Every structure is written in C-alpha cells, then in structure tokens.
C-alpha cells in the first residue's frame, strides 16, 4: 500500500514525560485545559471525565465549583413533574456542545468528531501524531492533488484529507502569561492535556511501577542465590563406577 | 484399590529402572560449600562455548528469512514509487 | 560471637517469623517513604505541591 494512504511515520520527538521516571508536567495541564476550553469549544466532546478528578492534579478546588456553576444538567423532576435544571457539581461530566450525534454531522460539514477523552490512546504513535497533525499542516496543498471543495489537507493523516479547520493560529489564547501566541505552545499543551485525560493515573502508576520493579529485582536476585544454594547439594555429586565381579 | 494399567515408571523402591550394582554416588551438603562457585569464569567461558556450538543453527534460518523480508519490502517500495502506471498494472493482474 | 545471634534468632522458628514480619512492616513503611521522596524531589516544579504555591500571590 502506498505511503499516500498510509501516512508519514511519526518522528520520535523527545517528549518531556516519555521517561521511565518522568511524570506529567501538570504545571502545563493548568493551561492545557485553558486552551482546550478556549479554542475547541463547540467542536469536540471530551465527554468522559468527571470534574471530581481535576482537583488535586491540576486545579486547587473552588475553581471547579465556580466553573460548574456555569452549566446545567436537568435535575430530578419537581413536585409538579415539570423537569428543571440545576447548576453542576463535583459529580458531573463535561458536556460536549453537540447534543447527541446529529448536530455533529449537521455543523462540521462532514463526519462525527471523535470524543477526545480517549483519542490519544486509539491512534498509532499516540503521544505524538496529534501535535504532528495539529502543526504538520502545510500552508498550501501539495501540487497535483485535487480535493473536495471546503475540505483541508493534512499530509500526516491516512489518505491526506481531513475536515479540520486549522484553528491553531497565534495571538488567540493568551493564557495568563507571556508564552502563547506561538502555535507550538497551544499544540504542546493540548497534547499533554489529552495524554493525561486518557489516563489521569500516570503519577501513581509510575510510582507503583518503580516500587514493584525494585522489589521484584531484589527478590529475583535473592531467588537466584537460593537456587544456586540448595541445588548445590546435587550438582556437585560424583559417581565412581566400580564394575562388579562377573559371577552369575 | 482398583488395579490399573501397566506403567513405565513405578514409585520409590519399585521404580522400574534396570537394576544396577557397583554405582556409587556422593554429596557434600549445601552448607559445606560456597553456593557461587565459578560464578564468573564458568559464566563467560561456558556461555561462549555454548554460543559457539549452536551459532549456525540460528544464524542460517534468520539470515535466509531476513533476506526474503528485505527483498519483499524493497520490491513493494519500488512498486508504489513513481511506478504505478508502468509496472504496477503489468504485475497486479 | 555469632553463636549468640544464632541461638537467639535462628534456633527458634517462632522468633524468626516474628522478626521477619516486624522487619517486613518497618521495611514496607520506610521503603515507601524513601521511594516517594526520591520520586518527588526528582521532579522539581513538575508536581502540584510547588505549582499551588507558585500560583498563589
């Protein structure tokens, strides 16, 4: 199969958290969420994670309540049976702006936009390839390729055609500091943010893994020693065949 | 108990192996000797002797199939590289 | 002499198992503390403990 429909192999970026002991730099999630909410507002979903897990990993506490006071979630029916809406709490999920599925194909002028909540686990070369795709777009499509009107080109996507309106410009987010307005920053932050949301459990997973590796290596060496020990009772034996007298 | 079929290995005492006489064994007990004897000398020397003895049996098949795999990959690459209008058609059928 | 150590620890299995369990407990606690500390200071500014202070002003 040709490389055109196969997609360029992702270059092996020396990522910050791609290390045996390195942890997520969630000094950057604090702005990754900011940029995600600011730019990808009414396009994707992220409809899997609950706000009672951002506190203690990215944010302090009262901020999540202050944000949840901005969404409504259709509380239990009242006495008269008329359904009502109440502000969100610390047991709710982020609402993807498209209600169920249909507005998705209605507005994107294309296909359904996948739920980002697990997207960077379900692509080959997951950690990268989303930074690659978000910044790898060229300004002008390669000469000699015809595409449907209204669509956009991406050499890194299998088939080289994607409906991603390239909203990754500069002078747009301005997080709180002097750092945005360069298209690498927002892409990198969103990449780490998504890589976290696929498993908001990396820190303790790595800690536990280190503990297990150390314990098991120590126990391995001890077991090797003990096997060399009690097996020595037979490995060093000898035999001296003294033939019997030929009498029968 | 219910008698069962014939078996090629008995239990202790009636083990079933050929009877032998004059064979003498020995032992020195685990506690009277160093557990790690040779540890390095035997490690390196026996490891290299063993790897030398059976090198070819794993070298040859791996080389043959690597040669196949490389040739197949290179021909596949050449097929879909500015050759889809003059070579791909005449061999796809 | 090691004869005293043997006859006080390894002659009797009950004390041997008691010591092995107590050592397991103390080892587990201290080992967990040490590993957590090492994994923590190994990442200065990468853990929320210092970010929460930096954001405060």
């Amino acid at each position: 199969m040709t490389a055109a429909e196969h997609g360029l192999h992702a270059p092996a970026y020396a990522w910050s958290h791609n290390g045996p002991f390195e942890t997520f730099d969630h000094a950057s999630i604090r702005r990754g969420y900011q940029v995600y909410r600011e730019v990808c507002a009414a396009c994707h979903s992220l409809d899997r994670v609950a706000w009672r897990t951002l506190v203690g990993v990215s944010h302090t506490n009262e901020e999540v309540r202050n944000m949840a006071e901005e969404f409504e979630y259709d509380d239990e029916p009242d006495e008269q049976g008329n359904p009502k809406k109440r502000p969100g709490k610390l047991s709710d999920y982020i609402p993807g702006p498209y209600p169920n599925e249909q507005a998705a194909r209605a507005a994107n002028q294309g296909a359904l936009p996948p739920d980002l909540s697990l997207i960077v686990k379900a692509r080959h070369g997951g950690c990268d390839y989303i930074f690659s795709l978000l910044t790898g777009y060229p300004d002008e499509p390669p000469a000699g390729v015809a595409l449907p009107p209204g669509s956009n080109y991406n050499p890194y996507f299998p088939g080289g055609s994607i409906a991603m309106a390239r909203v990754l410009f500069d002078d747009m987010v301005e997080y709180e500091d002097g750092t945005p307005a360069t298209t690498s920053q927002m892409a990198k932050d969103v990449t780490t943010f998504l890589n976290w949301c696929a498993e908001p459990e990396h820190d303790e997973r790595k800690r536990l893994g280190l503990k297990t590796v150390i314990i098991l290596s120590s126990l391995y060496l001890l077991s090797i020693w003990v096997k060399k020990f009690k097996w020595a009772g037979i490995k060093t034996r000898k035999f001296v065949f003294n033939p019997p007298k030929p009498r029968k | 108990g219910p008698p069962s079929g014939k078996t090629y290995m008995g239990w202790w005492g009636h083990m079933g192996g050929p009877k032998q006489k004059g064979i003498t064994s020995y032992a020195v007990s685990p506690y009277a000797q160093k557990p790690l004897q040779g540890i390095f000398h035997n490690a390196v020397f026996n490891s290299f002797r063993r790897f030398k003895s059976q090198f070819l049996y794993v070298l040859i098949p791996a080389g043959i199939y690597w040669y196949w795999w490389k040739n197949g990959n290179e021909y596949n690459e050449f097929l879909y590289s500015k050759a889809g209008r003059e070579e791909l058609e005449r061999v796809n059928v | 002499s090691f004869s005293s150590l043997y006859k006080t620890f390894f002659k009797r299995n009950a004390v041997f198992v008691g010591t092995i369990f107590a050592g397991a407990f103390v080892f587990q606690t201290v080992f967990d503390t040490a590993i957590t500390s090492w994994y923590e200071n190994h990442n200065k500014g990468k853990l929320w403990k210092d970010v929460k202070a930096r954001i405060a002003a």
Binding site: T236, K238, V240, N242 | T24, Y26, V28, Y31, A32, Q33, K34, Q37 | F2, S3, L5, Y6, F10
Partner: peptide, 24 residues
C-alpha cells in the same frame, strides 16, 4: 581407586573454617 577414596572436593569445599556461621 577404592570406594572409600572420596574424590577431591577441595575446589568446591568451603575454606578451612567449618560452617558454624554459614547457617546464619
């Protein structure tokens, strides 16, 4: 070589210090 002649274990035998501490 009569059976009583134990083969030379001196290569693997522990040094001339018995084993009253090795159990430990």
């Amino acid at each position: 070589k009569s059976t009583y002649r134990t083969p030379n274990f001196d290569d693997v035998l522990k040094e001339n210090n018995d084993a009253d501490k090795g159990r430990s």
